[PDB]
Design an enzyme around this catalytic site. Structure first.
Site, PDB file in Angstrom:
ATOM      1  N   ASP A 228     -16.402  19.834 -38.138  1.00 16.02           N
ATOM      2  CA  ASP A 228     -16.902  19.958 -36.772  1.00 16.02           C
ATOM      3  C   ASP A 228     -17.388  18.688 -36.074  1.00 16.02           C
ATOM      4  O   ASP A 228     -18.496  18.221 -36.320  1.00 16.02           O
ATOM      5  CB  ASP A 228     -18.020  21.010 -36.807  1.00 16.02           C
ATOM      6  CG  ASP A 228     -18.710  21.214 -35.461  1.00 16.02           C
ATOM      7  OD1 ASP A 228     -18.097  20.951 -34.402  1.00 16.02           O
ATOM      8  OD2 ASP A 228     -19.878  21.672 -35.477  1.00 16.02           O
TER       9      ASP A 228
ATOM     10  N   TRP B 213     -24.102  21.530 -44.052  1.00 18.92           N
ATOM     11  CA  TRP B 213     -24.866  22.602 -44.683  1.00 18.92           C
ATOM     12  C   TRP B 213     -23.956  23.649 -45.300  1.00 18.92           C
ATOM     13  O   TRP B 213     -22.849  23.863 -44.823  1.00 18.92           O
ATOM     14  CB  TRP B 213     -25.842  23.273 -43.687  1.00 18.92           C
ATOM     15  CG  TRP B 213     -25.210  24.074 -42.551  1.00 18.92           C
ATOM     16  CD1 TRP B 213     -25.007  23.654 -41.269  1.00 18.92           C
ATOM     17  CD2 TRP B 213     -24.780  25.444 -42.598  1.00 18.92           C
ATOM     18  NE1 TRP B 213     -24.483  24.679 -40.507  1.00 18.92           N
ATOM     19  CE2 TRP B 213     -24.341  25.791 -41.300  1.00 18.92           C
ATOM     20  CE3 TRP B 213     -24.729  26.416 -43.610  1.00 18.92           C
ATOM     21  CZ2 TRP B 213     -23.859  27.078 -40.983  1.00 18.92           C
ATOM     22  CZ3 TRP B 213     -24.243  27.704 -43.297  1.00 18.92           C
ATOM     23  CH2 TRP B 213     -23.819  28.016 -41.994  1.00 18.92           C
TER      24      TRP B 213
ATOM     25  N   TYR C 287     -26.420  26.542 -32.776  1.00 21.52           N
ATOM     26  CA  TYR C 287     -25.160  26.130 -32.181  1.00 21.52           C
ATOM     27  C   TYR C 287     -24.806  27.039 -30.997  1.00 21.52           C
ATOM     28  O   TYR C 287     -25.520  27.998 -30.682  1.00 21.52           O
ATOM     29  CB  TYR C 287     -24.031  26.228 -33.221  1.00 21.52           C
ATOM     30  CG  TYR C 287     -24.245  25.430 -34.490  1.00 21.52           C
ATOM     31  CD1 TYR C 287     -23.821  24.091 -34.585  1.00 21.52           C
ATOM     32  CD2 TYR C 287     -24.858  26.010 -35.602  1.00 21.52           C
ATOM     33  CE1 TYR C 287     -24.006  23.355 -35.765  1.00 21.52           C
ATOM     34  CE2 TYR C 287     -25.049  25.283 -36.784  1.00 21.52           C
ATOM     35  CZ  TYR C 287     -24.623  23.961 -36.861  1.00 21.52           C
ATOM     36  OH  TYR C 287     -24.820  23.255 -38.031  1.00 21.52           O
TER      37      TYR C 287
END
Lengths: 138, 326
Positions: B32, B39, B75
């Site tokens: 991303d 994570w 997010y």
């Protein structure tokens, strides 16, 4: 896409050339009686990490110039708050006023409502990510 | 070499494999460029999605290092909570030692439960990394594990394979012609300025310019709602009482190439790219969502866009390279 974060310490603390860095943000500059102490702590961390592989504060023993080990940190895009200090573009700007804080709480309130919507869709007159607090810009 | 193969799940998500700890525990993570943290689920996680994904066990790693630093990340599509820790991470044929990452405690939602990946590996700038955690790529460069301070990305189409992220390098084979360099307007996301969005020379949105980010983590080409609404109307995309943006599967073969003008160079996106054709039921590739920033209303150029061009993220001179996919 990343929108925001909040975290609690113990934040990594490092001293380079007498400049104290917490969470990679310039926290304060050491002068006089703390120059050696700073170098000392930096050596301590090195030993804890490279030798003892221990990151806990019990090995680290971070001194007061590292700021409170229980402070909060909020990250917005191009803007952040650590402890009572405001940082724009990773640069100290000033200490948060009670107005800045209120703005942080509001933001947390709106982000909370927005995440609820996001992670529970089976937007239709829905919610959009909240705008960053005003203090985050000029 | 130094590449990270990525799987293509329904042209909607691209993820590759990484190993964590000694010996390695594997996890699949979205690479991303829309964020900066790394994570993965952990044995400390209590959310639904964690009941059916790989979970990291610190006690199975002779190299792990705990901390009591907790963080919460949110997010555009979800959030997560966790605790930071340190370990060695295997990615793109490289051995990233002393990498800080999050062991999740929660990651709510059905999306994650049904998602075919375990975590997220943020590829954006450090300034947007939760708790200022050192991002994987910055760690690669700091430890000299990559030849050049950049990485390239190729995203397959029509569920094909071959997708990949090249760490520390560019590969000619994946593109034709030459790379057009675009300056990064704002360092955080991989942000660039969008000159104009126009089909048939007509300014349909983003007038006078707007800010945009290149994000592998987003599937669609999103833009502010007020503007997207026109976009739909300007292509024949209508909405039904089911949500989805219903639009003629025929329009594909008779519509104008919406062109994104970037730094004086036009980047055409044919309706054979911005139209999602699953069955004999076609849907739009644009998504309305206001993303307010101190830099204005953000436009997100997701896979719908990246699929068309090999994108190089250069941290050396802070630039984005673009060129049509070979």
């Amino acid at each position: 896409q990343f929108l925001f974060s909040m975290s609690t310490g113990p934040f990594i603390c490092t001293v380079k050339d007498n400049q104290v860095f917490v969470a990679n943000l310039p926290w304060t500059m050491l002068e006089g009686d703390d120059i050696q102490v700073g170098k000392e702590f930096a050596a301590r961390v090195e030993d804890c990490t490279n030798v003892k592989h221990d990151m806990a504060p019990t090995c680290t023993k971070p001194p007061p110039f590292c700021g409170p080990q229980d402070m909060k940190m909020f990250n917005f895009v191009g803007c952040s708050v650590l402890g009572n200090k405001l940082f724009i573009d990773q640069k100290y700007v000033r200490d948060l006023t009670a107005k800045d804080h209120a703005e942080v709480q509001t933001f947390r309130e709106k982000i909370a409502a927005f995440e609820e919507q996001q992670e529970n869709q089976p937007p239709a007159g829905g919610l959009s990510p909240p705008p960053p607090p005003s203090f985050c810009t000029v | 070499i130094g590449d990270e193969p990525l799987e293509n799940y329904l042209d909607t998500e691209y993820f590759g494999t990484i190993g964590i700890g000694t010996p390695a525990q594997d996890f699949t993570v979205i690479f991303d460029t829309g964020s900066s943290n790394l994570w993965v689920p952990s044995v400390y996680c209590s959310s639904l999605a964690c009941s059916d994904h790989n979970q990291f066990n610190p006690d199975d790693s002779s190299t792990f290092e705990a901390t009591s630093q907790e963080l919460s990340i949110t997010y555009g599509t979800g959030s997560m909570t966790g605790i930071l820790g340190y370990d060695t991470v295997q990615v793109g044929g490289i051995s990233d030692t002393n990498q800080i990452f999050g062991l999740s405690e929660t990651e709510p939602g059905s999306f994650l439960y049904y998602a075919p990946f375990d975590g997220i590996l943020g590829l954006a700038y450090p300034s947007i990394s939760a708790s200022g955690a050192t991002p994987v790529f910055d760690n690669l460069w700091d430890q000299g594990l990559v030849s050049q301070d950049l990485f390239s990305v190729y995203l397959s189409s029509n569920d094909d394979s071959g997708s990949v992220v090249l760490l520390g390098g560019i590969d000619s084979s994946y593109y034709t012609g030459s790379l057009n360099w675009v300056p990064v307007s704002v360092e955080g996301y991989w942000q660039i300025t969008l000159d104009s969005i126009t089909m048939d020379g007509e300014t349909i949105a983003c007038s006078g310019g707007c800010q945009a980010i290149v994000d592998t983590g987003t599937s669609l080409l999103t833009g502010p709602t007020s503007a997207i609404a026109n976009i739909q109307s300007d292509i024949g995309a209508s909405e039904n009482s089911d949500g989805e943006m219903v639009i003629s599967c025929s329009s594909i073969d008779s519509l104008p190439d919406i062109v994104f003008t970037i730094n004086g160079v036009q980047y055409p996106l044919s309706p054979s790219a911005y139209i999602l054709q699953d069955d004999d039921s076609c849907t739009s590739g644009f998504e309305g969502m206001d993303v307010p920033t101190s830099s204005g209303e953000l436009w997100i150029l997701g896979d719908v866009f990246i699929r068309q061009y090999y994108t190089v993220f250069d941290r050396a001179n802070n630039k984005v390279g673009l060129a049509p996919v070979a």
